[PDB]
CSV table of C-alpha atoms and ligand atoms in Angstrom, one decimal:
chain,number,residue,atom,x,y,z
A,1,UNK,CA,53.3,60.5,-56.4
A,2,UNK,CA,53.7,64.2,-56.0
A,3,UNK,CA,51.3,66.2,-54.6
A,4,UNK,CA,49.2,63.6,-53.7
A,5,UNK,CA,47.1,61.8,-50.7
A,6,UNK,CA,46.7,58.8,-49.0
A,7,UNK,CA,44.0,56.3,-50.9
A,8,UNK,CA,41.8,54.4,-48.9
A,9,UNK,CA,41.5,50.7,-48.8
A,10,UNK,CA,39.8,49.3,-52.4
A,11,UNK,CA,39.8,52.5,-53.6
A,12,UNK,CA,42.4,51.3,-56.9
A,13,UNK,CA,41.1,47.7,-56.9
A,14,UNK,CA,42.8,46.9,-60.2
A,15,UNK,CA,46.2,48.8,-58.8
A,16,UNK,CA,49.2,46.2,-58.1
A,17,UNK,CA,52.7,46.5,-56.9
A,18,UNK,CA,55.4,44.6,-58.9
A,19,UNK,CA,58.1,43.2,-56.3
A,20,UNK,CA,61.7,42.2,-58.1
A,21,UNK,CA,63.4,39.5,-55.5
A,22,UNK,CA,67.0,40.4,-57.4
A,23,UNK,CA,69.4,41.1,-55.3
A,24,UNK,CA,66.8,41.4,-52.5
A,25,UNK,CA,63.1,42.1,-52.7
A,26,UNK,CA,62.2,45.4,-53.3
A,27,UNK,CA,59.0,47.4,-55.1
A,28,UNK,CA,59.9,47.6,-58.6
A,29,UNK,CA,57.0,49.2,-60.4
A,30,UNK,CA,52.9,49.5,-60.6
A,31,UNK,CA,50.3,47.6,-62.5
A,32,UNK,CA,46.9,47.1,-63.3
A,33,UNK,CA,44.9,44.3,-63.1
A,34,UNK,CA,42.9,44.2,-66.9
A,35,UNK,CA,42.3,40.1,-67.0
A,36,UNK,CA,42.2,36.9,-64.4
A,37,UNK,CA,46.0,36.5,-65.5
A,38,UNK,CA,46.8,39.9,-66.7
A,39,UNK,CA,48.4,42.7,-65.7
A,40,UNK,CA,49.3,45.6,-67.8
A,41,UNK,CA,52.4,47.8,-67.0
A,42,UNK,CA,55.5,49.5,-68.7
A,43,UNK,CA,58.0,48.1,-70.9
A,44,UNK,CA,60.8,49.9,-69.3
A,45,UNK,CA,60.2,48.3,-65.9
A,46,UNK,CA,61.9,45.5,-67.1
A,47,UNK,CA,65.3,47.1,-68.0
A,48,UNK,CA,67.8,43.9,-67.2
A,49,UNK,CA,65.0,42.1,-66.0
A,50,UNK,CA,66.6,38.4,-67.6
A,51,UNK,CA,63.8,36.4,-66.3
A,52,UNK,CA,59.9,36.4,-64.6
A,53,UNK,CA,61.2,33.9,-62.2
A,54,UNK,CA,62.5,37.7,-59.7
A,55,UNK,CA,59.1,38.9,-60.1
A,56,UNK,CA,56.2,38.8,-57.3
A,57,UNK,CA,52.7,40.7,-58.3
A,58,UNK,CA,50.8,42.0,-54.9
A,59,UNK,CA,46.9,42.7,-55.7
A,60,UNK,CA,44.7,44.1,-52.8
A,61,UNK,CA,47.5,46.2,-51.2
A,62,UNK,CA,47.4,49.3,-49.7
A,63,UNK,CA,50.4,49.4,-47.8
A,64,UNK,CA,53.8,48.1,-48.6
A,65,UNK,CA,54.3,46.8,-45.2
A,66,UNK,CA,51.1,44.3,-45.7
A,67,UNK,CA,54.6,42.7,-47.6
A,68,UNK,CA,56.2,40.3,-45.7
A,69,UNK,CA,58.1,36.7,-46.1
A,70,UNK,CA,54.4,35.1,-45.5
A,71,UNK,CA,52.0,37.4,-47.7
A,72,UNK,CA,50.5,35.4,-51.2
A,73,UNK,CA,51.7,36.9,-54.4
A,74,UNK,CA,51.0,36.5,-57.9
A,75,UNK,CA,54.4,34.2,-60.1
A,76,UNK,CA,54.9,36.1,-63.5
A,77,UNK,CA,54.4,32.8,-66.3
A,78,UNK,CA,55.4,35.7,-68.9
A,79,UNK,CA,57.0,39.0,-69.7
A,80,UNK,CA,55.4,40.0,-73.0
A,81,UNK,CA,57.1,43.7,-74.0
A,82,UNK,CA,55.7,45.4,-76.9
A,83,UNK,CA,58.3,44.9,-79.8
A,84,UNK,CA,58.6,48.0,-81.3
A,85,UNK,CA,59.6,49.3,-77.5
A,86,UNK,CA,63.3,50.7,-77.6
A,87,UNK,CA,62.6,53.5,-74.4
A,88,UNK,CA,59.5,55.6,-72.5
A,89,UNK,CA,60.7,58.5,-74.4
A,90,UNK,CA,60.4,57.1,-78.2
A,91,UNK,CA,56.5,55.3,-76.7
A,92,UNK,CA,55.6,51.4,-76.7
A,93,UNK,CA,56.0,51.7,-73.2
A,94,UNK,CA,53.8,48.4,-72.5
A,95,UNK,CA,54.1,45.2,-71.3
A,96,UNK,CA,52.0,42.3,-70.2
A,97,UNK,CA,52.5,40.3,-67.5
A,98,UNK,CA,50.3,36.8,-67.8
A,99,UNK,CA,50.5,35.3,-64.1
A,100,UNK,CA,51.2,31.8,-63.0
A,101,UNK,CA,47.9,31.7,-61.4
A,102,UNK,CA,44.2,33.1,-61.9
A,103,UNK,CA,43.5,36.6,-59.2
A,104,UNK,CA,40.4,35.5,-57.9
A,105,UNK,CA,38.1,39.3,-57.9
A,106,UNK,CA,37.0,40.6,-55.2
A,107,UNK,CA,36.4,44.1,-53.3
A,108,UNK,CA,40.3,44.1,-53.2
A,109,UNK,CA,41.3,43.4,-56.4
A,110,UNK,CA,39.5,43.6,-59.9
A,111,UNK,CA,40.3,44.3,-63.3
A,112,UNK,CA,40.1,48.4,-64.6
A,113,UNK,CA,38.0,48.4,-67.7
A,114,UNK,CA,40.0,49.3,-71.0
A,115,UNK,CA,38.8,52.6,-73.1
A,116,UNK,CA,36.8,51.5,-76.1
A,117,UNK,CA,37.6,52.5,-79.4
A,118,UNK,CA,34.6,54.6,-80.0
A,119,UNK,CA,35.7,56.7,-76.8
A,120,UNK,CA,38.9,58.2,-78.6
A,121,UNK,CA,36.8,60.9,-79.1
A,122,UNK,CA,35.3,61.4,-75.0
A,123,UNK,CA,36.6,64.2,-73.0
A,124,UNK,CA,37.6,62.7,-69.6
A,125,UNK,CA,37.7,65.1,-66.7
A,126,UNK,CA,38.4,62.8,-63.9
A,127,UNK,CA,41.5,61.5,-64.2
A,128,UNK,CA,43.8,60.3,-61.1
A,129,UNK,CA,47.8,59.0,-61.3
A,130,UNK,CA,48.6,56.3,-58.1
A,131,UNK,CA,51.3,54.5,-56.6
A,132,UNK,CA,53.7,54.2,-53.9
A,133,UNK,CA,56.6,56.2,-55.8
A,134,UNK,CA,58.8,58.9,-54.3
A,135,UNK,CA,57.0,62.4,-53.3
A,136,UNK,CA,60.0,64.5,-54.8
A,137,UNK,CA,63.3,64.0,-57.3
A,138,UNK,CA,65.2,62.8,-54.2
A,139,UNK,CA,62.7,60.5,-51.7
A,140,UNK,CA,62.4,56.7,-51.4
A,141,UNK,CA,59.3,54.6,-52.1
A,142,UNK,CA,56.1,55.5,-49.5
A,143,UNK,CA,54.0,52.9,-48.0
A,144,UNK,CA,50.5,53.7,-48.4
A,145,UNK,CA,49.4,54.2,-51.7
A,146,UNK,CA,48.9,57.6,-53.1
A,147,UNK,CA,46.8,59.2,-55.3
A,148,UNK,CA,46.4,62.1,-57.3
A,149,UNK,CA,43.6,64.0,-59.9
A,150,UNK,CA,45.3,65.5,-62.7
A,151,UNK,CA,43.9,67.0,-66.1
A,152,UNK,CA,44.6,65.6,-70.0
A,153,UNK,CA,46.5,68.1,-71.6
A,154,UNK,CA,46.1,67.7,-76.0
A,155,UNK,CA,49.1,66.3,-78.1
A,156,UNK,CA,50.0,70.1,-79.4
A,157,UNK,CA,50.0,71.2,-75.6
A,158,UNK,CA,52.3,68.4,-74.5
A,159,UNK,CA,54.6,68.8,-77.6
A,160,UNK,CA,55.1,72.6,-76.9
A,161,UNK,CA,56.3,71.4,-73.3
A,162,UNK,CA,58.8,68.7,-74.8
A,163,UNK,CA,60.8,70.8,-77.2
A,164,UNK,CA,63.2,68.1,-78.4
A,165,UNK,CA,61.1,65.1,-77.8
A,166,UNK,CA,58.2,63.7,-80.7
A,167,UNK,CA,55.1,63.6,-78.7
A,168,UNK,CA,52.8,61.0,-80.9
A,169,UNK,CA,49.2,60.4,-80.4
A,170,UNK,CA,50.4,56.6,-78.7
A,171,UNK,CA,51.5,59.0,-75.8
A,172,UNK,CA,49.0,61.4,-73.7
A,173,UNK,CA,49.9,63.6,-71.5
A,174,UNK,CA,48.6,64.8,-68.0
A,175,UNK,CA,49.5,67.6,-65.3
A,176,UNK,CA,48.5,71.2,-64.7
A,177,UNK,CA,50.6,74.1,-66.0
A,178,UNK,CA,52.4,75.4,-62.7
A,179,UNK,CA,53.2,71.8,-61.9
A,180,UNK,CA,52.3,70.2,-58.3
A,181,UNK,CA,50.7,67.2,-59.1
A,182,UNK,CA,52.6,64.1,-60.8
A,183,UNK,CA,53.6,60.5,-61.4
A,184,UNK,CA,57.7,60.4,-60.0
A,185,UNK,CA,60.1,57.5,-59.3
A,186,UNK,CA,58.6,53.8,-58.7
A,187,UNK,CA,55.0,55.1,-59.6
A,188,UNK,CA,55.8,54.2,-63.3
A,189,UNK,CA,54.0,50.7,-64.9
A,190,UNK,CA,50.9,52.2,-62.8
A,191,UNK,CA,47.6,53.6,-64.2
A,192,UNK,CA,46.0,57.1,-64.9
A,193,UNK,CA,42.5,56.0,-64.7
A,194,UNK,CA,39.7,58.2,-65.0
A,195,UNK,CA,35.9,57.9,-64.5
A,196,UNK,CA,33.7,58.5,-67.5
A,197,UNK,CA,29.9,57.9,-66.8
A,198,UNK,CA,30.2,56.2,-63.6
A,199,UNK,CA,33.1,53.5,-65.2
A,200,UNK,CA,36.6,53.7,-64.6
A,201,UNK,CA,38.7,53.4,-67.5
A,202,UNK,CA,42.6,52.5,-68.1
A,203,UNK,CA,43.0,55.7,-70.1
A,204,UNK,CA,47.2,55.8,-69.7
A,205,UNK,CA,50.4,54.1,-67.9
A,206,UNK,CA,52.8,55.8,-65.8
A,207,UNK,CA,55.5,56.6,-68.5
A,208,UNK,CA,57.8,59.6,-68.2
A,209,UNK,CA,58.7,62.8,-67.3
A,210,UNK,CA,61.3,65.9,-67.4
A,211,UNK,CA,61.9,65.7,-63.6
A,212,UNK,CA,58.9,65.6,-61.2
A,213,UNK,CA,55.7,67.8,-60.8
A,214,UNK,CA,57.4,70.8,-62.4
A,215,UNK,CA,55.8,73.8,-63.9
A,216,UNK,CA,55.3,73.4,-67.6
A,217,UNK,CA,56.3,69.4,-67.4
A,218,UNK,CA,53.3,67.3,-67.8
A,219,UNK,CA,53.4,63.6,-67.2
A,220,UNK,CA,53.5,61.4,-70.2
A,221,UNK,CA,51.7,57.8,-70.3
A,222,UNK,CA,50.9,55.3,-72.8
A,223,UNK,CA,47.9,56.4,-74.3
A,224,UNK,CA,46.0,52.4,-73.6
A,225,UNK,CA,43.2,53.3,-76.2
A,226,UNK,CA,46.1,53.1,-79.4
A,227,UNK,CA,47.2,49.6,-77.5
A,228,UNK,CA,43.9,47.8,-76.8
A,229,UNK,CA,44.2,45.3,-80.3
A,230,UNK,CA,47.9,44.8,-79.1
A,231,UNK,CA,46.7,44.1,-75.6
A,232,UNK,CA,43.7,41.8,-77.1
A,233,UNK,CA,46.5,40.0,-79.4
A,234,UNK,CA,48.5,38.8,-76.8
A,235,UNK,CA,46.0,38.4,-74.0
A,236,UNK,CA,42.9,36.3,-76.9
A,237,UNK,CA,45.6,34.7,-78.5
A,238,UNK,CA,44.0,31.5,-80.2
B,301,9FD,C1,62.7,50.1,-51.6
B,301,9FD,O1,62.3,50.0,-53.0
B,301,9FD,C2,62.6,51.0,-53.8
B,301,9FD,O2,63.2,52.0,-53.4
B,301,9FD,N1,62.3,50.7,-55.1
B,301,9FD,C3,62.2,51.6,-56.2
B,301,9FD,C4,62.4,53.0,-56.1
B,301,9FD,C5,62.4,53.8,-57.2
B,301,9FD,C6,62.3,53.2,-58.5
B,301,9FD,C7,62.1,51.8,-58.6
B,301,9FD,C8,62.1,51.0,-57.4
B,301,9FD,N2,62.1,51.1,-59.9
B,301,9FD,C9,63.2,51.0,-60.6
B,301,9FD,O3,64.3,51.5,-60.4
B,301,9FD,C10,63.0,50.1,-61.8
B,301,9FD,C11,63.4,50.8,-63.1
B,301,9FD,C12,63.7,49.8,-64.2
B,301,9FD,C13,62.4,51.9,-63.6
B,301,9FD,C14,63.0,53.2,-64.0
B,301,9FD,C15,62.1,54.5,-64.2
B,301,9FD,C16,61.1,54.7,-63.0
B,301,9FD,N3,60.4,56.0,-63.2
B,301,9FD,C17,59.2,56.2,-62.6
B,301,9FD,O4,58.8,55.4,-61.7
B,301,9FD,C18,58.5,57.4,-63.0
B,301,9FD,C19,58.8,58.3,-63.8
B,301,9FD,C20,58.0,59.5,-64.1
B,301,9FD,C21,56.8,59.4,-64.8
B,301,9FD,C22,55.9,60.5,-65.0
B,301,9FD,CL1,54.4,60.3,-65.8
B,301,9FD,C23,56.3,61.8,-64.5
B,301,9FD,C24,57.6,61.9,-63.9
B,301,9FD,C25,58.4,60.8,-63.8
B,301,9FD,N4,59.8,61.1,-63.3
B,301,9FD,C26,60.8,61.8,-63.8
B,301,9FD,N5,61.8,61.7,-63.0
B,301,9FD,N6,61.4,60.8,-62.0
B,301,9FD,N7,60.2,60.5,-62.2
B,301,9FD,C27,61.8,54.7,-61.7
B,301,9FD,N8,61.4,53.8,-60.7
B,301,9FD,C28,62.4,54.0,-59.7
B,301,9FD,C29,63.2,55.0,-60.1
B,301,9FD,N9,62.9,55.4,-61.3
């Protein structure tokens, strides 16, 4: 996160941090807790992931260094990718991942409430992008979690700023127009939740963008509300 600031503990509740164990054990991306066994993310997280058997999902961290050899985790049963998904910058940037065992809630870790279909329409003004990703272009991962508010911006806004990209409505955009504030490397998979009459709501994931925080460059996510009856497909399957 650029521009950002230290969260405090249980702020993100429904935040995760997605652990690969291949070569050695390192963050890999963000999550969100939306289900008992389910956490949503991005599709691209997985690039040359061949098996859930490397991945380890943290709930109820706030800094990386809780981590250790001795600190419980969450096995991935299943890595469900979205199958129109071909990369962040054509969209389908989701993925599912249905644990080997059920996150028991608490004041640590909870699920984020998906957007209803009737709120396409809502205007949400308090939006905030987290994670433990890199603070510039060239940084390493940070251990406290991080947080940042940052405003929508339309479609038509965020397709004058990507000359050369299709910005559809299945991506939404968010960052202010002299740049500052933004998602950057290891943040992506996370949420952009906002707060819309006192509920938090899972209104995008950590996608993409033209280098980090610049002027102009608004950070794309996958815009959750256009994915809710894929996410209720795979997660109320009969
Ligand atoms: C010690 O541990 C570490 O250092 N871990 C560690 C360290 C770093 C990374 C990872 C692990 N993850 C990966 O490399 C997985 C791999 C498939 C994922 C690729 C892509 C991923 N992108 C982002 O996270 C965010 C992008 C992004 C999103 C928005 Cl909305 C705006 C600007 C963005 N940026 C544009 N340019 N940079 N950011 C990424 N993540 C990293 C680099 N790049």
């Amino acid at each position: 996160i650029v521009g950002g600031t230290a969260s405090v503990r249980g702020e993100w509740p429904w935040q995760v941090t997605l652990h690969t164990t291949s070569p050695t054990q390192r963050h890999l991306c963000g999550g969100s807790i939306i289900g008992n066994q389910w956490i949503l993310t991005a599709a691209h997280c997985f690039y040359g992931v061949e098996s859930p058997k490397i991945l380890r999902v943290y709930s109820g961290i706030l800094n990386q260094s809780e981590i250790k050899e001795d600190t419980s985790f969450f096995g991935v049963q299943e890595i469900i990718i979205h199958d129109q998904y071909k990369m962040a910058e054509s969209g389908y940037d989701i993925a599912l991942l249905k644990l080997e065992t059920t996150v028991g809630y608490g004041d640590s870790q909870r699920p984020i409430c998906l957007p209803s279909k009737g709120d396409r329409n809502v205007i949400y003004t308090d939006c905030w992008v987290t994670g433990w990703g890199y603070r510039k272009l060239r940084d390493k991962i940070q251990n406290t979690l991080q947080k940042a508010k940052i405003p929508l911006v339309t479609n038509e806004e965020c397709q004058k700023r990507y000359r050369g990209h299709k910005i559809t409505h299945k991506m939404i955009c968010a960052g202010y127009r002299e740049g500052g504030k933004d998602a950057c490397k290891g943040d992506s998979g996370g949420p952009l939740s906002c707060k819309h009459n006192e509920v938090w709501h899972l209104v995008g994931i950590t996608s993409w963008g033209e280098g980090c925080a610049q002027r102009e460059r608004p950070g794309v996510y996958t815009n959750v509300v256009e994915y809710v009856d894929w996410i209720l497909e795979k997660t109320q399957a009969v």
